[PDB]
Design a protein around this ligand. Sequence first.
Ligand SMILES: Nc1ncnc2c1ncn2[C@@H]1O[C@H](CSCC[C@H](N)C(=O)O)[C@@H](O)[C@H]1O
Ligand SMILES: [Zn+2]
Ligand SMILES: [Zn+2]
Ligand SMILES: [Zn+2]
Ligand SMILES: [Zn+2]
Ligand SMILES: [Zn+2]
Ligand SMILES: [Zn+2]
Ligand SMILES: [Zn+2]
Ligand SMILES: [Zn+2]
Lengths: 807, 8, 481
Amino acid sequence: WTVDKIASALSVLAEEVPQNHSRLVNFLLEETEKRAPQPRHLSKTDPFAHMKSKAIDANRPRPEGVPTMDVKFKQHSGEYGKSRNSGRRFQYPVVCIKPDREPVPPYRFHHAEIRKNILALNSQLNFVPHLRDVDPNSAEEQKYSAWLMDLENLDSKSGFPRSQKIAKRAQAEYAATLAPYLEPWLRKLNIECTKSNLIRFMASQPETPQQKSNLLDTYSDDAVRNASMFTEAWDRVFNDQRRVALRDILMLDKNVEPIFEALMQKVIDALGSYTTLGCLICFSHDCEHGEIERDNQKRCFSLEEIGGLMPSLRRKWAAQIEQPPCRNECYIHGTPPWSENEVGTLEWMFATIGYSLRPECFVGAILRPCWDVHRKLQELDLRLPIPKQKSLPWYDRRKKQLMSDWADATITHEHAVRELFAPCHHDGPCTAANGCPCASAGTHPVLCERFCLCTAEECPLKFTGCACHSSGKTCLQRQGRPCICVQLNRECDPTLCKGCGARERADPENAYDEVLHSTGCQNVALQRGAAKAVVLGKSQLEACGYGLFAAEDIEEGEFVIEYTGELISHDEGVRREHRRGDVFDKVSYLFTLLEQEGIWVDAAIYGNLSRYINHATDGNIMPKIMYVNHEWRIKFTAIKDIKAGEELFFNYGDNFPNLTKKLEVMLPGRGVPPLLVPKTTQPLFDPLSKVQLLPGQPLPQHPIDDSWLLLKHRDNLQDFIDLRPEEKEFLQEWDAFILRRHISSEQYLPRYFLRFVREKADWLVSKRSRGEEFSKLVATLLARRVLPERVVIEATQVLNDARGRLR
Amino acid sequence: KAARKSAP
Amino acid sequence: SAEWELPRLRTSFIFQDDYKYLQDLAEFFDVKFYPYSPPGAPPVFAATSKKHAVICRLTQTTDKDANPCEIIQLIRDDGNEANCASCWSKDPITDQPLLCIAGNEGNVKVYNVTEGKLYRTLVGHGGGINDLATSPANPYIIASASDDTTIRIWSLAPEHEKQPCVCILGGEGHSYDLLSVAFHDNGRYVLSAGHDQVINLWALPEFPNEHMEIPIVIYYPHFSSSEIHNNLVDCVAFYGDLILSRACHEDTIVLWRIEGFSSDDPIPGPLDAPTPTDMTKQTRSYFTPTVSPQSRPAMFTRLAQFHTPDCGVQFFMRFRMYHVPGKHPILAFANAKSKTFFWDLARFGEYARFMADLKEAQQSYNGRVVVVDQGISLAQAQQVHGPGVGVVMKPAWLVPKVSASPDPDSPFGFSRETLQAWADMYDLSNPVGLIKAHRSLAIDGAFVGRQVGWSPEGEWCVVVGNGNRALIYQRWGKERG
Ligand SMILES: Nc1ncnc2c1ncn2[C@@H]1O[C@H](CSCC[C@H](N)C(=O)O)[C@@H](O)[C@H]1O
Ligand SMILES: [Zn+2]
Ligand SMILES: [Zn+2]
Ligand SMILES: [Zn+2]
Ligand SMILES: [Zn+2]
Ligand SMILES: [Zn+2]
Ligand SMILES: [Zn+2]
Ligand SMILES: [Zn+2]
Ligand SMILES: [Zn+2]
């Protein structure tokens, strides 16, 4: 063999490609032709039979009153379609049909409802937005081509060429066509040349390491390597200056492309996926929290964001030292080879249970009798490894009160100027001297929150909830002692605000428990989620499309609705607004959430009926940005008594200019500066069907459908190369369940965990890997001190009962 | 250059 | 006989300008033959201008000078909107023909054509409607494609009268104005395409035979791609399970297939649909086959490209296939420079069979191959030339001007020029090759084709376009010389 000889031989083998292609296409045409369908739904008679030609001769006078239209007919004959004569013109009477229904007010995209704000990815323009026809070499052609150029200038500026995209697409198709031929051809040639040998040669050839390192790590370098000769011959035949180098095929190959204190280190390594992805807020591994980088890489709001497992696990152990037997042959008759994964299970459980509930019973329930794990635990001989600060003059965490020049001493309540930083996770005090971001990252200190690793006893910036307690209504926008939470523009914490009682009232299961909400906490409206009854209609403002109308009486001070949508950056907002624009001729659904941070809410597609509230400087509702369990949210509050049937309005603010109807940096958007269909002169619509509503009829209220959203989160997990199939399986199952609960507080985690354990009892005990992955979750939640011991004891009973029933 | 819907 | 016969121009008409007071503005954007008449009934089509619906009947004549086209109905939409879309349905009670017309106002007007009345209006879209298609499995099911970027599925059945929108194809599948919508023969799959250059395949659920307070909303297509074309897509159709589509600036009609797609397989549910997880993947599919040497197997295969020269920068030009059991499948399309093209798809197979036999005989007989036309038997031809000579039967339609004849006067094989000419029209070996039309007819004047229509028996092909012009092609005519 030589290059010349291989190339000559590949040229003959390559003849199979157009031969097989023609066989495929022809076979497909013939199968389609054979399976042609019989016409269906044919009428018994010709419905047109009784209808005569309406033609009136050209020579006749035109009919009186009725409109007439001319048609000129030509007859043709021969091979070249020559006209038989100049033609004949006829007059036809016209049947004039007036439309009787107006269209609904205009819109773009399908408007779907979301219960909560959803996180969006950054996007690129992948097409040519056609607006109208433009005459060649005109002012309009120039205006249009300048707008397209501006759009292209935003994508280059985003951080993410036509001729190359066309060439690449054409090369990708030709690579897919040739890839099934490589191995049959290599066998036919029988050169002492295999795909593995050709991948090895490619890896040992320029041109990026450590990607080439990763490949050689699995492939190695291994007599006479004439992989070079085959590679050259292939490039001579298939990569002519539809072309493809052997490299391009090999890079897309299934065996190539995807390859692009000891106890504690084992535990850290074992829990990696859970600590890296597990959300501190909602407990899901793919959710609406976290940050999206310019390249669409995601930084989850996880344990990793706060230093990983160890800083949190060490603090738990300290908090422990400063403070019934199981129904599975408990260690009580104390003291089959144990696999590596079984040893590991006992290890991460032992570590996270800490200086406590015993790991034995739980490990036995996940894996084995309780005594078996007790003696292995003794065989393995496993072992576990306040500088008084002055109170701030502007804040008292014991009394839960703000004082002095506090409005100037902090920016905790000034969400518009806040920049987001990871919760603090350092050892020493929370000061500028010790690099604490809560104390020093902003223009003024902000309070330390629930995820900061410091505690209320040692830290003077630690938020400790409000002191409010009343047999009547409390945590009011105007109170004896005022509500610190209301003053800081935040909702009450179900855990920190004890006895107000945000615990019961921020619980969605009590949303419509009217007797409960008549007393206690009045500062959990977003968490409660009970919006006022509203109805879509046509706005009273002239040529102003849709508007939102009250469908019940709303008293001044009442929560109306939340503004939901997609969470996007300022830059994504600019890209979106410009792509949807028209340089030759208005509607925006943007809302600034966090001005300084650059977080906007876009309700163009996903949101709720609040996206339809029109502008009025003198509105009857008022938006406000609230901090709600480390989520920033927009709520609307009534600023007048509103009657059922009245249109809702709010002042959009200073950053939305041309709103005159009454009665790259510049981004316009809103900013903070038996239920029946109600009686109104205005047409009212069902939000989905767009059918009109009749006043006096039941108000349509469709439950939110989030199965499409749960699907997206499941699929996001499935596409991770970093996750192992056994992990994907458990994480997808846990998230499908937990995402539905819309959790933002640890207070409700134990109840939902128990319900998960009770429901998935059978699924979990059925496969050894599920129980293993489940124990890793429990370990991460215990390390975080979020999961109480009592629920882990209960889960042991539920799991031990699940198997055995399975026998 | 630009696409056209109407007849020329 | 005459199964190989292709159409010839028989009639043409110009319908009076109806838009000049509201680029030359008047166009016939659509043409649709009535599909529910009994077998053998005179074919009827509706041609839709910006303001009118022209309903014609075609009758075969024995007189070359006689007019086969008669206008039996002429309706004016007395609104202040331009129409561009139509499809046929039937009254669920009387079985009378219903003509649906839609345009830039965003409403579907449903006309009782025999009586000249408005039967009903379908209201709900947020922008102009660009295309309509009736389901082949249910005549009461209509899909509309709109500038609002969604597809609405409507039912004219009495049980859905109060709320006729049964389904909305929404989510983020499309991001710009939709130009084309098409149903599979089974009525469960829908193809959509437009300005965003994405071609989406959606799976429709079964619609209950009762009042639906809300339509069923579909968030994800089961197959999605913006990779078949590099430009806006203005025409999409199924051809059995295969797909036909055209884009602007390409001068082709692309025949392709979704890998792993079979309409014999159970219909996937909404949650089987892939989601756009990676923004860098411009193709996604639920159908993808699991066996391939590629890590991410190919999700579609370009099969062939019908050459459609001189479309230039023009868009909103639609092609149409004649696909009926017992007759040859014929593709028709008119370009932006006064030509009508025809392809007889059954020619491909006979040509392929003839060239396979010709290639086999050349190798087995060292080029000693005599070709004889079909219409003399193979057996009797073999006796004439002897055992040393290979005999190949050639289709009679394959007319002269695999290796070529050694010299011009050789008794074996064909000239390079003959073989090249045939390959241009019939060779299907190259997915990025250009298939020359089997018939190309010149049109007098300047004409841009908008839509093509075939009669149930395929004897008529109507092409409509600019200046409100209709071109009527015929085959298997009764004209006497
Ligand atoms: N007071 C006002 N004057 C003029 N336009 C207004 C307005 N209030 C709202 N708008 C219009 O409504 C848009 C905000 S979206 C609100 C819903 C919208 N009317 C719809 O039909 O979908 C603005 O971009 C503007 O086009
Ligand atoms: Zn989360
Ligand atoms: Zn025990
Ligand atoms: Zn700190
Ligand atoms: Zn602190
Ligand atoms: Zn802190
Ligand atoms: Zn309070
Ligand atoms: Zn509080
Ligand atoms: Zn409270």
